[PDB]
Structure 1
Amino acid sequence: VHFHPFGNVNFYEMDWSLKGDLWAHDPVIAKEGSRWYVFHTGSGIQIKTSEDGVHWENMGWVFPSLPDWYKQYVPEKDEDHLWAPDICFYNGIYYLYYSVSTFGKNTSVIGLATNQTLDPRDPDYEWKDMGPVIHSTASDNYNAIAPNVVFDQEGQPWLSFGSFWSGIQLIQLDTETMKPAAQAELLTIASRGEEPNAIEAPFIVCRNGYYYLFVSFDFCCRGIESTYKIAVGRSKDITGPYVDKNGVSMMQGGGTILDEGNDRWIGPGHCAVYFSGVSAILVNHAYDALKNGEPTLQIRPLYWDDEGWPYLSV
């Protein structure tokens, strides 16, 4: 994956017994040179760095002070937590999308910050506020949060996002601006078909002629009472229809459950998937039942069966 570079590493041979500062929620990962980076939800977007991808250390944040334009979209927001960042590398630039919102409401806006490098030691290191990408108002039937960028086989960048309301949305981005055209069509590609519609945090990857849509089912943010689950569906066309193993459309609650946790790791969710050579990893957070349900970073090797469906090992 050119936009999610990891080259020169086999995730399947590594020991993923994470150590260090592992508190995280809605994480994504990027690697530049010998340095690994984690971006996740928190004040001004929290960052963690690692030498091997296993031992993590907190490394500050993206926005020391929130851009004033946030108020034009979410005037009621009072605190400085920015949610569910997404990172990708294109044309020598790092594109970091994130969410500005308030819990339980859809008055939200997805923003974009860019940097020439992820290394704070480099003279070119500077997170630039490149403004809003797409937003939702109370009158909209969707929620503009939890972005994920994917470049299809033809090199066309697409932005997927969404949480509750109508569900998962999809829209084309322009390669130059990396923002959707003013007249771009917004497409709904997945929904539980229930009320409330508990589906969010989309992440799309392409593997062997298929596009896989990973999403999170049910409830996050409730500590050991979270009911988060990771589900997946696929399609030959990035615009859908995404269908699960049983042939059920993801627009009708379809989705094959990849992980629903256990009595030790509660509600795993808001995932990300990365590849390297022939290996792949599943990234997400889960609530620690042994530690007051604190959200913890999880990285595990992700395999793919003969049918091409992903699965976690035992």
Structure 2
Amino acid sequence: MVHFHPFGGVNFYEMDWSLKGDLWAHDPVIAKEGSRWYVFHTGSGIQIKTSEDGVHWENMGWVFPSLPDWYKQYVPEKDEDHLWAPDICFYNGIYYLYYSVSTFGKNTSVIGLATNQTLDPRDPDYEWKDMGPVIHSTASDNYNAIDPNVVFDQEGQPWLSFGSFWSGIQLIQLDTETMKPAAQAELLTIASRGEEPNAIAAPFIVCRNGYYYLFVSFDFCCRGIESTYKIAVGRSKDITGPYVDKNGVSMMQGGGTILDEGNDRWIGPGHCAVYFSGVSAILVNHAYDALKNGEPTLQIRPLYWDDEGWPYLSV
């Protein structure tokens, strides 16, 4: 359905989603090129996994063997190589991979962009090119420049949403030829718990049947079995909002309908992505494995939509 997140002839609803293989993942996204599937997720130099069928996964290296020097202009206290929360989209033959450079609990952060002609390392044209910073935050800003997501609207215009804590979820128009915001582009805040510490993060926007759906993660990641992350959603007819949940509550005031808050087995599901193929759709996220000391684990499940258009997972 979605040209910039294409999955080909796959039908997500008629597939076994009992995942196997190397499933350690935190903040995943997924892309498909030809018959090959790829996961990008948080880790050293942006970790990659690949699959033939979307179900059996195996590790596939990383994007950056060495971090670009320019990171230190934005995040000088960072002294490890872990890059956070990548986002992948495909436009006019180029793969655009956004990602976050940050340190935990601070908003000295920057979102970068890498591009490639192909996702397939066997291709002679495979090369992740460092296309530099996209947007950043300093301790003087009231937002945190991590957790990117790109969506192209109805008119074909690209937009970037991002954010984690501080004032919450931000939105800014991208220019098509740069895939970066204009220097004077307005930064809009589109979702917030409305109170401290403002535990909202990991935005992902999709368009379906005349509405934009803003998926976010509430509460606290990164605590293993003690994590409290949950996936929430609201919607808006216009991409700039207002985003409102099932109950009429604005997502700027803590609104958000809970899609998954986990259970005793899979704790703290969160940092999600939503993809379509034909009439089918999937939710992708990580969750913390209660039987493997909280190890973050890739989840992929079919995502359904009810008569009013709201998403739901099956039992």
Band the TM-score falls in, shorter-chain normalisation: over 0.9
Q: Which residue of 1 aligns with 2:235?
A: 234
1:214 and 1:185 map into 2 onto residues whose CA distance is: 22
Is residue 105 of structure 2 the alignment partner of residue 104 of structure 1? yes
Q: Which residue of 2 aligns with 1:182?
A: 183
- Which string of whole-angstrom CA distances, capped at 9 and with x for unpartnered residues, describes residues 138-172 of structure 1? 00000000000000010000000000000000000
Shift of 1:204: 0.1
Shift of 1:194: 1.4
C-alpha contact (below 8 Å) 2:51/2:57 kept by paired residues: yes
Q: Which residue of 2 aligns with 1:59?
A: 60
2:196 and 2:74 map into 1 onto residues whose CA distance is: 26
C-alpha contact (below 8 Å) 2:75/2:102 kept by paired residues: yes
Is residue 213 of structure 2 the alignment partner of residue 212 of structure 1? yes
- Which string of whole-angstrom CA distances, capped at 9 and with x for unpartnered residues, describes residues 158-212 of structure 1? 0000000000000000000000000000000000011000000000000000000
1:142 and 1:181 map into 2 onto residues whose CA distance is: 18
2:159 and 2:211 map into 1 onto residues whose CA distance is: 15
1:262 and 1:128 map into 2 onto residues whose CA distance is: 41
- Which string of whole-angstrom CA distances, capped at 9 and with x for unpartnered residues, describes residues 266-312 of structure 1? 00000000000000000000000000100000000000000000000
- Which string of whole-angstrom CA distances, capped at 9 and with x for unpartnered residues, describes residues 223-255 of structure 1? 000000000000000000000000000000000
- Equivalent residues in 2 for 1:141-220 (5 A)? 141-220=142-221
Alignment TM-score, normalising by the size of structure 1: 1.00
Is residue 124 of structure 2 the alignment partner of residue 123 of structure 1? yes
2:262 and 2:75 map into 1 onto residues whose CA distance is: 34
Q: Which residue of 2 aligns with 1:290?
A: 291
C-alpha contact (below 8 Å) 2:245/2:257 kept by paired residues: yes
2:162 and 2:284 map into 1 onto residues whose CA distance is: 17
Partner SS, residue 261 of structure 1:
coil
1:3 and 1:214 map into 2 onto residues whose CA distance is: 18
2:119 and 2:246 map into 1 onto residues whose CA distance is: 38
C-alpha contact (below 8 Å) 2:243/2:250 kept by paired residues: yes
1:226 and 1:193 map into 2 onto residues whose CA distance is: 21
1:22 and 1:208 map into 2 onto residues whose CA distance is: 33
Partner SS, residue 224 of structure 1:
helix
Shift of 1:34: 0.4
1:163 and 1:9 map into 2 onto residues whose CA distance is: 33
1:77 and 1:83 map into 2 onto residues whose CA distance is: 12
- Equivalent residues in 2 for 1:8-47 (5 A)? 8-47=9-48
Shift of 1:18: 0.1
Partner SS, residue 69 of structure 1:
helix
1:304 and 1:5 map into 2 onto residues whose CA distance is: 19
1:91 and 1:104 map into 2 onto residues whose CA distance is: 36
1:268 and 1:194 map into 2 onto residues whose CA distance is: 22
2:165 and 2:140 map into 1 onto residues whose CA distance is: 14
Partner SS, residue 3 of structure 1:
coil
1:52 and 1:85 map into 2 onto residues whose CA distance is: 21
Partner SS, residue 170 of structure 2:
strand
Shift of 1:81: 0.1
Moved over 3 A (4+): none
Q: Which residue of 2 aligns with 1:73?
A: 74
1:186 and 1:7 map into 2 onto residues whose CA distance is: 34
- Which string of whole-angstrom CA distances, capped at 9 and with x for unpartnered residues, describes residues 9-40 of structure 1? 11001000000000000000000000000000
Shift of 1:56: 0.1
- Which string of whole-angstrom CA distances, capped at 9 and with x for unpartnered residues, describes residues 91-118 of structure 1? 1000000000000000000000000000
Shift of 1:7: 1.9
C-alpha contact (below 8 Å) 2:8/2:34 kept by paired residues: no
Runs (5+) with no aligned partner, structure 1: none
1:126 and 1:10 map into 2 onto residues whose CA distance is: 30
Runs (5+) with no aligned partner, structure 2: none
Partner SS, residue 69 of structure 2:
coil
Shift of 1:69: 0.1
1:9 and 1:101 map into 2 onto residues whose CA distance is: 36
